[PDB]
Amino acid sequence: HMFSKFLMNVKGVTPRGSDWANRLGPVALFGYGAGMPRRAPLLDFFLQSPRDCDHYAELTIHDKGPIECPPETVMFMPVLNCGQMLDEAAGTETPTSDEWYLGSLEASTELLEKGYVPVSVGGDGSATLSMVEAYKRLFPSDDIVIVHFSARPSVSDPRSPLRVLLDKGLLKGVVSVGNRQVSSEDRKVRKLHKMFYMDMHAIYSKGLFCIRDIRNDYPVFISIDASVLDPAFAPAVDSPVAGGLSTRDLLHIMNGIRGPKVVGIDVYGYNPDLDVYRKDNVGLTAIALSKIIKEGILKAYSISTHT
Amino acid sequence: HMFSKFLMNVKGVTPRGSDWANRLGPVALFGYGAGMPRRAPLLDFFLQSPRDCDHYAELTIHDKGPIECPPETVMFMPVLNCGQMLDEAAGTETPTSDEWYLGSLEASTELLEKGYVPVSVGGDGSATLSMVEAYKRLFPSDDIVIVHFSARPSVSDPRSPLRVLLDKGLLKGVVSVGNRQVSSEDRKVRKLHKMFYMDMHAIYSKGLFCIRDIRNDYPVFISIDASVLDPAFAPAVDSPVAGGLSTRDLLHIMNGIRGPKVVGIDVYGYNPDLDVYRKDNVGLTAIALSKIIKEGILKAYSISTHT
Amino acid sequence: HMFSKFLMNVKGVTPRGSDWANRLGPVALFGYGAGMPRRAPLLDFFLQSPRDCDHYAELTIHDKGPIECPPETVMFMPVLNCGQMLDEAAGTETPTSDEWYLGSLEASTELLEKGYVPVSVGGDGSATLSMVEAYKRLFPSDDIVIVHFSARPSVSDPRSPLRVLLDKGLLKGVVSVGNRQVSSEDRKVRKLHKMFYMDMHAIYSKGLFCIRDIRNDYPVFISIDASVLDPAFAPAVDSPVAGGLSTRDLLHIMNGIRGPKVVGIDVYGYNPDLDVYRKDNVGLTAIALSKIIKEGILKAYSISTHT
Amino acid sequence: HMFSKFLMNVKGVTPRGSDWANRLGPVALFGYGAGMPRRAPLLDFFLQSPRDCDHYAELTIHDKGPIECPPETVMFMPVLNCGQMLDEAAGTETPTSDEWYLGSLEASTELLEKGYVPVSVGGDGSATLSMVEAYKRLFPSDDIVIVHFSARPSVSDPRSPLRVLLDKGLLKGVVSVGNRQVSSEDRKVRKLHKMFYMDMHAIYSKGLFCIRDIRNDYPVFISIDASVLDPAFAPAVDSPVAGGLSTRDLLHIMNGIRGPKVVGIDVYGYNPDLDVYRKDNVGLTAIALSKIIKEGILKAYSISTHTEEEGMERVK
Amino acid sequence: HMFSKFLMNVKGVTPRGSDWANRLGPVALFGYGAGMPRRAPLLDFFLQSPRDCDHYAELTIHDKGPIECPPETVMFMPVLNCGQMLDEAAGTETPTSDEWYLGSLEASTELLEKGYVPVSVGGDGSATLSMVEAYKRLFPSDDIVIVHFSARPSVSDPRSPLRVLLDKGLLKGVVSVGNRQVSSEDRKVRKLHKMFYMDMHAIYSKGLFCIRDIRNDYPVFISIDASVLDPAFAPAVDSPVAGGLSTRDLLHIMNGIRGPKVVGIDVYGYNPDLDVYRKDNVGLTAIALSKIIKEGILKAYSISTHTEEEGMERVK
Amino acid sequence: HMFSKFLMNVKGVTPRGSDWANRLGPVALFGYGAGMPRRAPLLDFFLQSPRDCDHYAELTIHDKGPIECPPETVMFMPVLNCGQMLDEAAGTETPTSDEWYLGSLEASTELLEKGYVPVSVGGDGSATLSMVEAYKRLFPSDDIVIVHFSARPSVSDPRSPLRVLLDKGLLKGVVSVGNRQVSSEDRKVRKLHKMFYMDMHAIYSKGLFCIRDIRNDYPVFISIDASVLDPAFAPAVDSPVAGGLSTRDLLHIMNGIRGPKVVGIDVYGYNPDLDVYRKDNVGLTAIALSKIIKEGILKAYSISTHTEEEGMERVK
């Protein structure tokens, strides 16, 4: 409804240039706000952040096409900024969770068929559900695995984005990283669906930096909940749980993610009303998530299935 | 005096059910406020926190008995909430350090003879002195060792809780973990009483996650000062010292604590007036200490002398 | 101009006692404010901080001489407090970057010829330029190497303190530690001047605590930018970059710095208007940098070329 | 014929008792000499070696049943000594390859149907083909994985035991350990049959005492060629290849073998005429190999699919 | 009698000078052949081996005093060669067990009272019993710990040297290193006398180059059985057990031995008739053992209770 | 004379083709027997050993050219077998030291000018002096570093090959690996010529599989004395020193050798009369050494200055 301006802009996105096949990318970036306050400054804060990555590459942000492939010598990575989905000036009505879903499912379908890798910033994680279904519908043959970073397994509620994808059998497998609050009900669902998981204490006690190897052949959807970070690095989350990952811990682990291609990326769990602020009113979580998004984009451009 | 309501409630606590012998536990929880502001929100914040532990077990909080042993298949851990010692509505008079001592010594004696493991939350660390003496008086034959987590050795002042226990010879040994501010006077007392210590830089440079082994046969009292954490994780401490433990560091190390039983647990050094707050007025230290308390309780239920 | 009171005080500093030759030290401490707000509380906050180091030694702060060598049994380390360079009560005029330079170059020249090791606290890093030139002019034969801790290489701008020293060929070599934002232009300058660097992800993935060895024979200038720390530990920096060093990480690495003597120390990049504050108005970065300064001083007293 | 005395003794073996209900074991031990000199003293030398193992347990060797399942915690491991297959006394004729096969096939078949874990000692590796086919014929349902210790992949030759098992499609998977002489034809067969391998240099550089905890749920056959050991430890092999495992290395690696049960064990590649001998005529390889056989027997009694460790899942 | 020539030479040894004031050493070296063949060439072969050690120091062998305490930093280690105990020339009679004991007891007694650290070479291990009792008789005040390198616990037999020392209550503690053949009766004695042990498989899995820094304050006797080494390195032992230490492994582990001083050293378990020989008749075990004896002597000159490292305390 | 047949065959070698444009190789292999018994079978035994290497590549031995540069990805490594230097058939006179030198000097000179990497097998180490001087005479511009594997520094004697090269100032640097017998005169020469060294105990304690990634840009000569290996792996050396590298250890360490190219390789210190033999008269050292020669040849074909890893610089 007030996604309409955002939706029509994605509809007219110039399709993948014919030199982007046999090539990872390009990356399509947009803002997602489901379950979060209307004022969502994370996407804009990212666009303001420096574009030099941890690895020796640089993001190139374009508000509109044409998005064309550069030489692999200069190593630039084009990002098409599709902006916020919610037109914050088109009204005061709050979109229902079903409206967020439909709008997200439509934007993902469009960006994927156009040949872009969709990267959603913000929201409560419901975006994961919509753009995984969008890929599965467009490519029913492909097997999808989800690498999910969170403090919680988030598969307790049958209406959870991860739980819905599992019950509908759209996922080949699930990799849960950094859980540190696991209920018995979570364990039952983990057993039933046979999920692979590495809880926080397990990662720590077995060399946190000693994570590099093991081969994965299936296209990967990367779902990142901000709560996977320790509250000292990411306070702006609902019901924080201490003893989590550092920002550098998270970057290292996600750098070791293997696969033939990235299905999509979801960064979420961020609430500006819960953040810790510097005296100049900049939030800690925004700073942390800004670099996570960047290295997520780089991963979408450089992911390999085995080394 | 205004501990009277709290004290009479402990007096009527139903003694250990006859299926709790040959069994670790149960755990008795109460609030302690000596040397700290009257508004002590840490205990209440803990009771509000999620009860799923790092390990696959769950705390079960009861305000009153009966506290009975469940099957070891369901793995529940009963915690008897005895509430705050200081009746914050009974007056405006501040209890002296001697009154805090007497009240704490009486509550500990009662909870121990009832068959409970006492866990004290809050205060300045003086609670350590009182419930160690309460155990020693009730069990003069048993040898007690203290595992003490702090940024400082805290044995300089002859009136320090740790120093008093040492001079009175109630301790078999002392394990100081994570010191990073050691005076020459501290070193003299460490030499005289032959304390085992692993300073912060020593822990770090010799594999922080490489701490697991070595056998201990003596019942352990766990004394945890919040200052042992780095100020980035626990700012709410008097005279903070940078370069400390992360929350995950602390959880890992305390998980490796060995012994036949836990004498008692002291979590302290927390001042709400010194904390760093999120925009929704929740303090970082409260979040950190909330999980430390939980895994301390779990340790009291699962501690083993050697593996 | 309003450095005049500070400058005349350094002019009358009692020269190195004749028992300080064949001996590392003493250390001269002063405040530097170039490129930063006039209210610079870092130096005063350090002087207020505890003086017990990580290692079993203690700083002894003297506002005036005589600064004489104590026995190596008591292990005291004299620090001559020269106070803030900018007389915050002498006027409202802001010194130009050229005035900061001249004033700093003059104070360094004086403190060095007096036999002191200069330690500058605060500013934007321009102090590095002035006291390295002061040493080179006084000792043209000696070869100088810089160990530089920063999130950025800071050699992009031809007017950067590090870049100027390089182009003028006053440095034997450059060790950049903890970069995590490297532009292509940075890489070109790193290649041209043949700088040794260990970027953040490289340090982390190859055992962060596994850094100890390798021999260095050249006198070392230690330049520390606060941005090298993760924003969770040091938020008070311009344009923060997540995924940085912890305070303990930094202390460990700098402890492994080898050399025959310390040329000088620069701690900078701190802006009180950008810090995260506790409820009692103490900044996190100030706490972190306070201990970095202390162990920097200790390094100036105990540095060795190889073990 | 040559195997007559041995076979009829194997027939009369009283099947394992009901006391072994859902229990690993027991183990049946016999000599196998295909492709090797007539004097095959490795079996005799093992039966003379100490019974105490690395881990705290004791071998108990028996020539005849009943094989009593010991009290739950005494840590005894009964072994049924079935003796030598070839009876050198009766006859002077060397069995053909196919005769060795049929002999090993029937012996393995009988012991398996009686509920024994067969452990073959000696030979050139042809035993691996026989007893794996004996198990697969008796239990077509079970999926078998082979852990193969050797200096060579031993699948280049179309007539090789392992290559035959793979071409017949009788194996779920193959784990080759300690190869250090791999031909191009080997590598062509490796990808063709998708077999897992950890070459010798790869084991060494990635911490020899750091071999993973991958969970295996398929019954394991353990095929051990002596050539996997360095010639300094096991010189009694044809065409020795330097740069191999130490006996300690091998014991550690085989101790990490995972599975619900062992389908069978084959220890081979030993030739007395190629050994290095002490002044009292005891060979070094035989010393090393008797230790290998013993810990192989212990593995058959205590193998497990994985070590359950809370907080982390296990890759299959 | 048989020990007559050796004993009277030991008697005439000029006691260590005053220059050794509060100093480790010196070391007295002698041959000991109890339980072993008459030709015992290990001592002669050691005296022929190079003097330069692993760590930068040089052995200086002497047959007669005075043994001058070298300048503080020249890194010379004087060794007093006391020769063979049994004189094969004088007489053809084999000494009984008790005669070996009394001979070793008196020799050890004399060298200790003269201020020498006794290093015995050869025999079956009976020397450990003698010189430990010689030290304990001379210094009842001192508490002794024994570090025992062997493939076997060697305390099952009530008549075993180590078992006798434990039953007589002459030891503060015992550290058994490298066991890989442990019987149930052994384990019963181990808990009964509360002896510390690190079996071979435990040493290997937990990083062989990762043995701890536990502080020891008691004087150490070092009892070294050659069987602790793998048969590939030391085949000249009775009943060899595969899967042992390399010579390098052993040198590293014994280099980590802590203590105020060494009470004595015994290197045994070597039999020339069981060795593996090169074409020029040099045995492998003798090569390995001479290196072991040398680094044992160096240990006696430079042993320390602990390495003081700031920030962390040391477990006793 | 003695080298007549060998030399004139070396002269007629057709120089490497233009297909080797900016390419490592090819390798020329020849026997060298200075200081050793007349029967020198190490070369023959290597030419009989399997061609397949540790890493996936295959040796292809040739007696005569043309040596065709193989397709870019077939992983063949052509080796030119130049045979034995000394022709035992023609004449019964032992060459003097200087005659060995001149023979090796001219052979090395010819092969280098033809664009071959010379690999010498056998001798006492004198070959190192010859071919390094042959390279330095042909390429005075290039700075050479020597990687020297030995149990001894081998620079005490003023007449030692390495000491001569250092005194003549023909080397940029020297990396001594695996020393375990270092005299005081050695240490005096070490600081005097500022040579880098990693002694055996230092390699072991600091993780044997943990040797660094230091970048080297100078052409490397690889001088390999068999004594660097433990006597259990290589007993056929003069005055054996226990506590050395395993064959595996050595292969790993030499695989980490960095450089733009190999100037030459010398494998020596082997004496058939000092070896330990199997019952079929095959020596253990020869087995180990043929593996060493093979991986040395592979190193000459695939050596690199450093592994470029993003984010961290390399110490030169």
PDB file of C-alpha atoms in Angstrom, chain E residues 97-246:
ATOM      1  CA  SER E  97      71.563 -60.541  43.330  1.00  0.00           C
ATOM      2  CA  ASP E  98      72.383 -59.590  46.915  1.00  0.00           C
ATOM      3  CA  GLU E  99      76.063 -59.236  46.042  1.00  0.00           C
ATOM      4  CA  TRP E 100      75.145 -56.776  43.286  1.00  0.00           C
ATOM      5  CA  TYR E 101      72.996 -54.961  45.839  1.00  0.00           C
ATOM      6  CA  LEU E 102      75.721 -54.662  48.487  1.00  0.00           C
ATOM      7  CA  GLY E 103      78.245 -53.622  45.851  1.00  0.00           C
ATOM      8  CA  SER E 104      75.962 -50.930  44.485  1.00  0.00           C
ATOM      9  CA  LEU E 105      74.934 -49.948  48.019  1.00  0.00           C
ATOM     10  CA  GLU E 106      78.519 -49.323  49.149  1.00  0.00           C
ATOM     11  CA  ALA E 107      79.604 -47.610  45.929  1.00  0.00           C
ATOM     12  CA  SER E 108      76.598 -45.278  46.003  1.00  0.00           C
ATOM     13  CA  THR E 109      77.180 -44.622  49.709  1.00  0.00           C
ATOM     14  CA  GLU E 110      80.808 -43.601  49.184  1.00  0.00           C
ATOM     15  CA  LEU E 111      80.152 -41.314  46.214  1.00  0.00           C
ATOM     16  CA  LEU E 112      77.267 -39.561  47.984  1.00  0.00           C
ATOM     17  CA  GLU E 113      79.304 -38.940  51.141  1.00  0.00           C
ATOM     18  CA  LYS E 114      82.041 -37.506  48.924  1.00  0.00           C
ATOM     19  CA  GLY E 115      79.458 -35.156  47.432  1.00  0.00           C
ATOM     20  CA  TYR E 116      79.000 -36.796  44.034  1.00  0.00           C
ATOM     21  CA  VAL E 117      75.813 -37.420  42.088  1.00  0.00           C
ATOM     22  CA  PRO E 118      75.934 -41.139  41.212  1.00  0.00           C
ATOM     23  CA  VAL E 119      75.032 -42.187  37.669  1.00  0.00           C
ATOM     24  CA  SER E 120      74.687 -45.935  37.162  1.00  0.00           C
ATOM     25  CA  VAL E 121      74.726 -47.452  33.677  1.00  0.00           C
ATOM     26  CA  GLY E 122      73.383 -50.879  32.748  1.00  0.00           C
ATOM     27  CA  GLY E 123      71.729 -53.661  34.710  1.00  0.00           C
ATOM     28  CA  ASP E 124      68.100 -54.688  35.116  1.00  0.00           C
ATOM     29  CA  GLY E 125      66.943 -51.810  37.310  1.00  0.00           C
ATOM     30  CA  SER E 126      68.076 -53.240  40.643  1.00  0.00           C
ATOM     31  CA  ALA E 127      70.441 -50.268  40.930  1.00  0.00           C
ATOM     32  CA  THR E 128      67.467 -47.986  41.620  1.00  0.00           C
ATOM     33  CA  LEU E 129      66.806 -49.853  44.868  1.00  0.00           C
ATOM     34  CA  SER E 130      70.433 -49.663  46.010  1.00  0.00           C
ATOM     35  CA  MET E 131      71.370 -46.008  45.530  1.00  0.00           C
ATOM     36  CA  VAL E 132      67.985 -44.689  46.686  1.00  0.00           C
ATOM     37  CA  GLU E 133      68.495 -46.627  49.927  1.00  0.00           C
ATOM     38  CA  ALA E 134      72.052 -45.300  50.074  1.00  0.00           C
ATOM     39  CA  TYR E 135      70.748 -41.744  49.852  1.00  0.00           C
ATOM     40  CA  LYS E 136      67.910 -42.341  52.308  1.00  0.00           C
ATOM     41  CA  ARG E 137      70.317 -43.899  54.811  1.00  0.00           C
ATOM     42  CA  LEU E 138      72.669 -40.929  54.486  1.00  0.00           C
ATOM     43  CA  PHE E 139      69.885 -38.331  54.389  1.00  0.00           C
ATOM     44  CA  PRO E 140      66.761 -39.574  56.226  1.00  0.00           C
ATOM     45  CA  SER E 141      65.588 -35.956  56.368  1.00  0.00           C
ATOM     46  CA  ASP E 142      65.232 -35.478  52.603  1.00  0.00           C
ATOM     47  CA  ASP E 143      61.999 -36.461  50.867  1.00  0.00           C
ATOM     48  CA  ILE E 144      62.664 -38.202  47.556  1.00  0.00           C
ATOM     49  CA  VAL E 145      60.540 -38.409  44.426  1.00  0.00           C
ATOM     50  CA  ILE E 146      61.225 -40.924  41.662  1.00  0.00           C
ATOM     51  CA  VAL E 147      60.670 -40.240  37.978  1.00  0.00           C
ATOM     52  CA  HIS E 148      60.404 -43.658  36.338  1.00  0.00           C
ATOM     53  CA  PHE E 149      60.509 -44.078  32.555  1.00  0.00           C
ATOM     54  CA  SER E 150      59.330 -47.531  31.479  1.00  0.00           C
ATOM     55  CA  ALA E 151      56.920 -49.427  29.239  1.00  0.00           C
ATOM     56  CA  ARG E 152      55.744 -51.224  32.381  1.00  0.00           C
ATOM     57  CA  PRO E 153      54.796 -49.955  35.872  1.00  0.00           C
ATOM     58  CA  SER E 154      57.227 -52.562  37.257  1.00  0.00           C
ATOM     59  CA  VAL E 155      55.532 -52.751  40.668  1.00  0.00           C
ATOM     60  CA  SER E 156      53.347 -55.849  40.272  1.00  0.00           C
ATOM     61  CA  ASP E 157      56.022 -58.189  41.609  1.00  0.00           C
ATOM     62  CA  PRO E 158      56.447 -57.824  45.405  1.00  0.00           C
ATOM     63  CA  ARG E 159      60.197 -58.245  44.834  1.00  0.00           C
ATOM     64  CA  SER E 160      60.448 -55.417  42.283  1.00  0.00           C
ATOM     65  CA  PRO E 161      62.903 -52.588  43.156  1.00  0.00           C
ATOM     66  CA  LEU E 162      60.301 -49.812  42.955  1.00  0.00           C
ATOM     67  CA  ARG E 163      57.724 -51.881  44.840  1.00  0.00           C
ATOM     68  CA  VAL E 164      60.276 -52.555  47.581  1.00  0.00           C
ATOM     69  CA  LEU E 165      61.074 -48.844  47.914  1.00  0.00           C
ATOM     70  CA  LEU E 166      57.359 -48.089  48.228  1.00  0.00           C
ATOM     71  CA  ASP E 167      56.713 -50.883  50.726  1.00  0.00           C
ATOM     72  CA  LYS E 168      59.652 -49.675  52.822  1.00  0.00           C
ATOM     73  CA  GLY E 169      58.156 -46.184  52.686  1.00  0.00           C
ATOM     74  CA  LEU E 170      61.287 -44.453  51.417  1.00  0.00           C
ATOM     75  CA  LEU E 171      59.638 -42.294  48.747  1.00  0.00           C
ATOM     76  CA  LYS E 172      57.577 -39.109  48.912  1.00  0.00           C
ATOM     77  CA  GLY E 173      56.067 -39.821  45.499  1.00  0.00           C
ATOM     78  CA  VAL E 174      56.452 -41.606  42.166  1.00  0.00           C
ATOM     79  CA  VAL E 175      55.970 -40.281  38.631  1.00  0.00           C
ATOM     80  CA  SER E 176      55.576 -43.102  36.099  1.00  0.00           C
ATOM     81  CA  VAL E 177      56.116 -41.995  32.504  1.00  0.00           C
ATOM     82  CA  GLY E 178      55.354 -43.821  29.273  1.00  0.00           C
ATOM     83  CA  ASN E 179      53.654 -46.997  30.478  1.00  0.00           C
ATOM     84  CA  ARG E 180      51.865 -48.938  27.743  1.00  0.00           C
ATOM     85  CA  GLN E 181      51.506 -52.364  29.341  1.00  0.00           C
ATOM     86  CA  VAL E 182      49.588 -52.030  32.607  1.00  0.00           C
ATOM     87  CA  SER E 183      48.106 -55.077  34.344  1.00  0.00           C
ATOM     88  CA  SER E 184      45.186 -55.090  36.781  1.00  0.00           C
ATOM     89  CA  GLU E 185      47.547 -55.910  39.642  1.00  0.00           C
ATOM     90  CA  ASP E 186      49.601 -52.891  38.597  1.00  0.00           C
ATOM     91  CA  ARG E 187      46.559 -50.613  38.813  1.00  0.00           C
ATOM     92  CA  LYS E 188      45.782 -52.077  42.235  1.00  0.00           C
ATOM     93  CA  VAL E 189      49.256 -51.117  43.461  1.00  0.00           C
ATOM     94  CA  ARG E 190      49.021 -47.706  41.790  1.00  0.00           C
ATOM     95  CA  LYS E 191      46.022 -46.546  43.828  1.00  0.00           C
ATOM     96  CA  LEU E 192      47.328 -48.321  46.935  1.00  0.00           C
ATOM     97  CA  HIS E 193      50.518 -46.255  46.904  1.00  0.00           C
ATOM     98  CA  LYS E 194      48.881 -43.252  45.223  1.00  0.00           C
ATOM     99  CA  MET E 195      51.478 -42.947  42.470  1.00  0.00           C
ATOM    100  CA  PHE E 196      51.208 -40.407  39.665  1.00  0.00           C
ATOM    101  CA  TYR E 197      51.338 -41.722  36.108  1.00  0.00           C
ATOM    102  CA  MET E 198      51.051 -40.535  32.519  1.00  0.00           C
ATOM    103  CA  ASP E 199      50.544 -43.512  30.215  1.00  0.00           C
ATOM    104  CA  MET E 200      51.901 -43.499  26.669  1.00  0.00           C
ATOM    105  CA  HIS E 201      48.578 -42.918  24.899  1.00  0.00           C
ATOM    106  CA  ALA E 202      47.790 -40.052  27.274  1.00  0.00           C
ATOM    107  CA  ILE E 203      51.116 -38.357  26.557  1.00  0.00           C
ATOM    108  CA  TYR E 204      50.581 -38.675  22.814  1.00  0.00           C
ATOM    109  CA  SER E 205      46.982 -37.448  22.539  1.00  0.00           C
ATOM    110  CA  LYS E 206      47.563 -34.486  24.856  1.00  0.00           C
ATOM    111  CA  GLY E 207      50.450 -33.100  22.803  1.00  0.00           C
ATOM    112  CA  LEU E 208      53.773 -34.862  23.328  1.00  0.00           C
ATOM    113  CA  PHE E 209      55.525 -31.480  23.192  1.00  0.00           C
ATOM    114  CA  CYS E 210      52.958 -30.176  25.690  1.00  0.00           C
ATOM    115  CA  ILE E 211      53.998 -31.536  29.085  1.00  0.00           C
ATOM    116  CA  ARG E 212      53.202 -29.266  32.005  1.00  0.00           C
ATOM    117  CA  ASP E 213      55.091 -26.898  34.294  1.00  0.00           C
ATOM    118  CA  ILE E 214      54.161 -28.416  37.661  1.00  0.00           C
ATOM    119  CA  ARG E 215      56.564 -27.253  40.380  1.00  0.00           C
ATOM    120  CA  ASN E 216      58.546 -29.938  42.224  1.00  0.00           C
ATOM    121  CA  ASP E 217      60.581 -29.181  45.348  1.00  0.00           C
ATOM    122  CA  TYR E 218      61.702 -32.690  46.274  1.00  0.00           C
ATOM    123  CA  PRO E 219      65.068 -34.173  45.191  1.00  0.00           C
ATOM    124  CA  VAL E 220      64.585 -36.410  42.154  1.00  0.00           C
ATOM    125  CA  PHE E 221      65.873 -39.871  41.359  1.00  0.00           C
ATOM    126  CA  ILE E 222      65.687 -40.588  37.636  1.00  0.00           C
ATOM    127  CA  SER E 223      65.092 -44.259  36.842  1.00  0.00           C
ATOM    128  CA  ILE E 224      65.262 -44.868  33.097  1.00  0.00           C
ATOM    129  CA  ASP E 225      64.277 -48.210  31.582  1.00  0.00           C
ATOM    130  CA  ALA E 226      65.194 -48.468  27.899  1.00  0.00           C
ATOM    131  CA  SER E 227      61.857 -50.178  27.231  1.00  0.00           C
ATOM    132  CA  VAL E 228      60.127 -46.790  27.445  1.00  0.00           C
ATOM    133  CA  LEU E 229      61.499 -46.130  23.967  1.00  0.00           C
ATOM    134  CA  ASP E 230      59.831 -47.715  20.952  1.00  0.00           C
ATOM    135  CA  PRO E 231      61.526 -50.968  19.790  1.00  0.00           C
ATOM    136  CA  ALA E 232      62.481 -49.143  16.574  1.00  0.00           C
ATOM    137  CA  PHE E 233      64.734 -46.932  18.709  1.00  0.00           C
ATOM    138  CA  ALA E 234      65.581 -49.385  21.486  1.00  0.00           C
ATOM    139  CA  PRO E 235      65.055 -53.038  20.474  1.00  0.00           C
ATOM    140  CA  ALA E 236      67.642 -54.391  22.941  1.00  0.00           C
ATOM    141  CA  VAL E 237      65.108 -54.929  25.736  1.00  0.00           C
ATOM    142  CA  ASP E 238      63.427 -58.028  27.159  1.00  0.00           C
ATOM    143  CA  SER E 239      59.872 -58.475  25.861  1.00  0.00           C
ATOM    144  CA  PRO E 240      59.642 -55.353  23.646  1.00  0.00           C
ATOM    145  CA  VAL E 241      56.407 -53.361  23.572  1.00  0.00           C
ATOM    146  CA  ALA E 242      55.627 -51.400  20.408  1.00  0.00           C
ATOM    147  CA  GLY E 243      54.198 -47.876  20.489  1.00  0.00           C
ATOM    148  CA  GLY E 244      56.757 -46.092  22.638  1.00  0.00           C
ATOM    149  CA  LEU E 245      58.703 -42.842  22.816  1.00  0.00           C
ATOM    150  CA  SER E 246      61.260 -41.715  20.271  1.00  0.00           C
TER     151      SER E 246
END
